[PDB]
PDB file of C-alpha atoms in Angstrom:
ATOM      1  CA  UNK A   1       0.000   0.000   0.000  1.00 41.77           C
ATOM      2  CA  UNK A   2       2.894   2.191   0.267  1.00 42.69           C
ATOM      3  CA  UNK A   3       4.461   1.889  -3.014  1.00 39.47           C
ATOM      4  CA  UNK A   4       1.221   2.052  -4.399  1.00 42.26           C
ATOM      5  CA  UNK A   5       0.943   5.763  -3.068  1.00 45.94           C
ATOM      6  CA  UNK A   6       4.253   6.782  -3.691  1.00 44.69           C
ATOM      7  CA  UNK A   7       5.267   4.875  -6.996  1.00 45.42           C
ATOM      8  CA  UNK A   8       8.910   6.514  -6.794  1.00 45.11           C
ATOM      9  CA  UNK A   9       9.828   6.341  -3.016  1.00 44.09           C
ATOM     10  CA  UNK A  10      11.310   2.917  -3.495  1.00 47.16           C
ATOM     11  CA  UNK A  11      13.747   4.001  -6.351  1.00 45.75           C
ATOM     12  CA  UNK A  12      14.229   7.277  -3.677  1.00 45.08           C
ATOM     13  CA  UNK A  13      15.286   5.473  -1.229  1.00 41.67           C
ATOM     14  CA  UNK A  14      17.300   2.748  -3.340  1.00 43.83           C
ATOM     15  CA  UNK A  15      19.150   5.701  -4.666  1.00 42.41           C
ATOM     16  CA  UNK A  16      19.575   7.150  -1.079  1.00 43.44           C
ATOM     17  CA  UNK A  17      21.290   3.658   0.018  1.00 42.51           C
ATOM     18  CA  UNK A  18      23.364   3.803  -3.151  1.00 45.15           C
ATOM     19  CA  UNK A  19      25.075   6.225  -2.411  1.00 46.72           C
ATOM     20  CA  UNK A  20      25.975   6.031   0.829  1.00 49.76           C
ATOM     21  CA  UNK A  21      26.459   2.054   0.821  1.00 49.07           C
ATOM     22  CA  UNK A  22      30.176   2.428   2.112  1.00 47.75           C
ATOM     23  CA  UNK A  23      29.397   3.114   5.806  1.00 49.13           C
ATOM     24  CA  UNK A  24      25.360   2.514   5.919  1.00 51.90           C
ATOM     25  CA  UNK A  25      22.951   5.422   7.178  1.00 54.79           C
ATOM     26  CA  UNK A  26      20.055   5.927  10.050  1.00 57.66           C
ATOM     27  CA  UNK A  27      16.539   6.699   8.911  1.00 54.47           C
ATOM     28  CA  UNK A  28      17.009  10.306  10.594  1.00 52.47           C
ATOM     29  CA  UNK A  29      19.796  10.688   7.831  1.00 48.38           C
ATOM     30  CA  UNK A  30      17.995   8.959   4.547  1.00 50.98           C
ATOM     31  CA  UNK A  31      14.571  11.607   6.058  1.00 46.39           C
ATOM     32  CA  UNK A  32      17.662  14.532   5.991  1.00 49.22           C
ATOM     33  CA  UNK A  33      19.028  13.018   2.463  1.00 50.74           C
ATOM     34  CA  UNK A  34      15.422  12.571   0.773  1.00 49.24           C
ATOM     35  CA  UNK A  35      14.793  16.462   1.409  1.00 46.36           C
ATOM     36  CA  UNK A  36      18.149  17.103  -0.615  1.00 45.68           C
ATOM     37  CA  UNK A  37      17.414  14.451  -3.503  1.00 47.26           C
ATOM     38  CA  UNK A  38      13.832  15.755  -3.862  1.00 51.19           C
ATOM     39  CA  UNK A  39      12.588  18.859  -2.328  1.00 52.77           C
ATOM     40  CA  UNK A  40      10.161  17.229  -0.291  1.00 53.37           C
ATOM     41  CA  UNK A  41       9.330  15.728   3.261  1.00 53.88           C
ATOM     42  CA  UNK A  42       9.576  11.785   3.577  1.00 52.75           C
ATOM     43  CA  UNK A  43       6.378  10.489   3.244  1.00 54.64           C
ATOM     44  CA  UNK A  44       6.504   7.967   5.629  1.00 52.88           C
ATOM     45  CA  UNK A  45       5.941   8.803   9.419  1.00 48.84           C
ATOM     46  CA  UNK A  46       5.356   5.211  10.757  1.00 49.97           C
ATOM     47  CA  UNK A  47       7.124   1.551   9.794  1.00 50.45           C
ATOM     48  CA  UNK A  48       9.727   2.542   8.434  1.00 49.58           C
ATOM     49  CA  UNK A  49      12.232   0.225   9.470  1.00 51.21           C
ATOM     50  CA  UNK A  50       9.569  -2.698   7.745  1.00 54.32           C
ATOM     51  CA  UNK A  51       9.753  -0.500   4.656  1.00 53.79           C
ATOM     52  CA  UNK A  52      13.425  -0.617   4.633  1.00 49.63           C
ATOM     53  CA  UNK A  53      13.288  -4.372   5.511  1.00 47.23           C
ATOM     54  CA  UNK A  54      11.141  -4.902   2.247  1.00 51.94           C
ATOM     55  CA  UNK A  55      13.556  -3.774  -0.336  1.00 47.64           C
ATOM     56  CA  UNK A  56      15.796  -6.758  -1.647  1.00 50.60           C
ATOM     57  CA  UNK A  57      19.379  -6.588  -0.613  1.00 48.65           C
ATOM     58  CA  UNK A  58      18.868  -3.734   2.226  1.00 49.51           C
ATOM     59  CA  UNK A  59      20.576  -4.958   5.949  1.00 48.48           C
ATOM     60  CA  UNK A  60      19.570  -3.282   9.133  1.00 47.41           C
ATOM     61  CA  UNK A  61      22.094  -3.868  11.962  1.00 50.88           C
ATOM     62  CA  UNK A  62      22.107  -2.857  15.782  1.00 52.54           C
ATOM     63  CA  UNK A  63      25.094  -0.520  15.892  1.00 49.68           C
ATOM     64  CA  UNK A  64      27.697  -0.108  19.296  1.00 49.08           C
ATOM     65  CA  UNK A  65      25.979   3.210  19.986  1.00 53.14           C
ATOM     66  CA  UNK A  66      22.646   1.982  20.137  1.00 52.16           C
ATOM     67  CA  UNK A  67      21.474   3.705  16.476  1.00 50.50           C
ATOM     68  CA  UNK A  68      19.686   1.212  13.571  1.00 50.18           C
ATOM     69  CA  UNK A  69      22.010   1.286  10.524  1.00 44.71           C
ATOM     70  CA  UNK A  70      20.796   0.212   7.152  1.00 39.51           C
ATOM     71  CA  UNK A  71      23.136  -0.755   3.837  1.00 38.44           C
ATOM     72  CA  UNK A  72      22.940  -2.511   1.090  1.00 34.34           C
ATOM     73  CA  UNK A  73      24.350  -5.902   1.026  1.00 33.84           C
ATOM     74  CA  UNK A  74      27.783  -6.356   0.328  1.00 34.88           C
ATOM     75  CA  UNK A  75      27.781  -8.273  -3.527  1.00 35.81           C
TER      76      UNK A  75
ATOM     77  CA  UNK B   1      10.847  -3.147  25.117  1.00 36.74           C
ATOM     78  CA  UNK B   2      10.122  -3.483  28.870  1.00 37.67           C
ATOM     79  CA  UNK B   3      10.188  -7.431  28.100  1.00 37.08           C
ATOM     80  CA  UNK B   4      13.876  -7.156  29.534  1.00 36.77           C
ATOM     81  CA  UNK B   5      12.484  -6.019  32.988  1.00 34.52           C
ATOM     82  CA  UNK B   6       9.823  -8.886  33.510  1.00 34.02           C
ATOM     83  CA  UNK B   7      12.106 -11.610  31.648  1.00 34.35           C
ATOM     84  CA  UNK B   8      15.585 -10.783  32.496  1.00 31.11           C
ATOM     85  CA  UNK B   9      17.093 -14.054  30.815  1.00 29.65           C
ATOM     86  CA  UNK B  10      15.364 -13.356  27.236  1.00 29.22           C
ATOM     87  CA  UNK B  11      18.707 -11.376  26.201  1.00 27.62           C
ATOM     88  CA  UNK B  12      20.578 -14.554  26.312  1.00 34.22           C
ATOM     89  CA  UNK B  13      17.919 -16.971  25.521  1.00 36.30           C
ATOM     90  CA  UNK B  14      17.687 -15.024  22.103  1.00 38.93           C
ATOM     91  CA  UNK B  15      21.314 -14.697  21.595  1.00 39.58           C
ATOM     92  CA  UNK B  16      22.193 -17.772  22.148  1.00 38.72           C
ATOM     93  CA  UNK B  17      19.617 -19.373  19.324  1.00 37.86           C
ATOM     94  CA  UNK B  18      21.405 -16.643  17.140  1.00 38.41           C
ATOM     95  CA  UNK B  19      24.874 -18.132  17.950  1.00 37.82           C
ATOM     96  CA  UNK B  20      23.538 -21.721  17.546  1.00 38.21           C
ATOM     97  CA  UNK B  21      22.382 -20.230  13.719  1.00 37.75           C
ATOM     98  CA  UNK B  22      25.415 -17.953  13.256  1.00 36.28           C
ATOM     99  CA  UNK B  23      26.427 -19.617  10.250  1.00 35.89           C
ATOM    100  CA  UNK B  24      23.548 -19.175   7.850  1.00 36.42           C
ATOM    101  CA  UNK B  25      20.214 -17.119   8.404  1.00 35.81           C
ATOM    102  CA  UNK B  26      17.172 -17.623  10.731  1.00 36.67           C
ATOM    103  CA  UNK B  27      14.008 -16.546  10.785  1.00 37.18           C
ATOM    104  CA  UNK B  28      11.565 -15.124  13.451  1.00 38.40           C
ATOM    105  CA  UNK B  29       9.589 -18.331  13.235  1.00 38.77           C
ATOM    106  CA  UNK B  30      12.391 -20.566  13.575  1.00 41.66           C
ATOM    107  CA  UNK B  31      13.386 -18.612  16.378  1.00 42.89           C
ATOM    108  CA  UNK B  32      10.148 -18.859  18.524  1.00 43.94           C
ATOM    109  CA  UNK B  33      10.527 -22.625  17.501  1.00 40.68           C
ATOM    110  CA  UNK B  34      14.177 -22.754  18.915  1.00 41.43           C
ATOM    111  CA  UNK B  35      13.308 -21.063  21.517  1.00 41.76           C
ATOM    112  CA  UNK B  36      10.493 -23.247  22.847  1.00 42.26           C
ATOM    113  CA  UNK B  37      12.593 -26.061  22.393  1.00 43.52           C
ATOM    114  CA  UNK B  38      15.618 -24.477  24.137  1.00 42.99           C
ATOM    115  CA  UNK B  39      13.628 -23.249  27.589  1.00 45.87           C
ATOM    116  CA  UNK B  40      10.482 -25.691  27.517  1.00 44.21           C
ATOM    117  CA  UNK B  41       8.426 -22.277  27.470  1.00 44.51           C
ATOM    118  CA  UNK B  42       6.556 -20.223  24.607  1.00 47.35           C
ATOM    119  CA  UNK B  43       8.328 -16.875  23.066  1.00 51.54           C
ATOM    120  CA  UNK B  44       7.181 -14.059  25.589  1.00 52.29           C
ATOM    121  CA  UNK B  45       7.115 -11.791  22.683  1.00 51.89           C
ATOM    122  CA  UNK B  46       4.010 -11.300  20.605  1.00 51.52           C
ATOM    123  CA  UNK B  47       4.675  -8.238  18.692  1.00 48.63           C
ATOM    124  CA  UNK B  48       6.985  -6.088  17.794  1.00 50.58           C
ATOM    125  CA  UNK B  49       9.856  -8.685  17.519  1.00 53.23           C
ATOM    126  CA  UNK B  50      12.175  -6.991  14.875  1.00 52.25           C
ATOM    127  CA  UNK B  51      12.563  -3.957  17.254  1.00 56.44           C
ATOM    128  CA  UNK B  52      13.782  -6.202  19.838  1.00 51.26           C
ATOM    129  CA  UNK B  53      16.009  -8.204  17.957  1.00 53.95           C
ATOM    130  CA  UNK B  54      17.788  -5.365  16.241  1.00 54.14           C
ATOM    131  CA  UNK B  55      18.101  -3.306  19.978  1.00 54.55           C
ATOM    132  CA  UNK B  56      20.444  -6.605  20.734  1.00 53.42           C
ATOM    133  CA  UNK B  57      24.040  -5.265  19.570  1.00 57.28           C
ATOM    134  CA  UNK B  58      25.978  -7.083  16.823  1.00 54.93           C
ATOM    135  CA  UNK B  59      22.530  -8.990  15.289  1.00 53.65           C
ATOM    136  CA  UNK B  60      21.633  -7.445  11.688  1.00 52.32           C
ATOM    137  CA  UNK B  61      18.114  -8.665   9.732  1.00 52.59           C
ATOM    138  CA  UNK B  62      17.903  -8.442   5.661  1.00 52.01           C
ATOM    139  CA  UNK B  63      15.426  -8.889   3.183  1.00 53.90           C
ATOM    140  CA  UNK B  64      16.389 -12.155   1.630  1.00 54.44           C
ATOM    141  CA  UNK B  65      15.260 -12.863  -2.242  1.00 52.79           C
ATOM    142  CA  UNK B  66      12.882 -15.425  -0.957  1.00 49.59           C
ATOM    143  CA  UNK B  67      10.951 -12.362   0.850  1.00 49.43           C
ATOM    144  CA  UNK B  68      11.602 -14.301   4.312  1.00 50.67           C
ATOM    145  CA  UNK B  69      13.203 -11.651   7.082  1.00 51.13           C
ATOM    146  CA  UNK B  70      16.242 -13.621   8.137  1.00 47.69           C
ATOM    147  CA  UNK B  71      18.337 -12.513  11.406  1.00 46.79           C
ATOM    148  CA  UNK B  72      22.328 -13.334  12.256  1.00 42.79           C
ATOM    149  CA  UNK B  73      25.422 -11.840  14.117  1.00 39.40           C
ATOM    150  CA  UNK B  74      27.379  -9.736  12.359  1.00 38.50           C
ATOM    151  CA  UNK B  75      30.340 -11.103  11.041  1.00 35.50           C
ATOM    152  CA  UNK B  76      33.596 -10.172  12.482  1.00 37.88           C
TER     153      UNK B  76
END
């Protein structure tokens, strides 16, 4: 029901993750990154972590200070 | 999660299923099924398990191909 919504916030997020897929990035960060890539507010406000979850090849990872990391897979 | 306050061994339960699975994936399911077999007692968690397993430092989750959530420790 989200992507249905928002047909391009996968491929904004995707491209988020892209480019930062050398040391990951916290969803405060990809929320502070989507306002640069797009001129808008993130859409989401809730679940975001399961929307991350749901894109193929995206990790999420309990970091030593506490803060939820995502990345894309290492290939 | 307060679940830490009224079961104060669930940290280790948990972690140790991980480090019995450390070398491929497991699931959430095959977690709560390791688990019961492992303390003779149900999962104490009904929701909301994803948050706890990724406030447990060192355990990452990814969206496998197959669609299935699958949890290990970090290697290295």
């Amino acid at each position: 029901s989200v992507r249905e919504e928002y047909p391009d916030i996968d491929s904004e997020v995707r491209a988020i993750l892209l480019s930062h897929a050398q040391n990951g990035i916290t969803i405060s960060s990809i929320k502070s990154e989507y306002r640069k890539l797009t001129g808008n507010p993130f859409p989401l406000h809730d679940n975001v972590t399961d929307f991350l979850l749901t894109i193929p090849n995206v990790t999420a990872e309990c970091s030593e200070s506490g803060k939820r990391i995502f990345n894309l897979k290492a290939s």
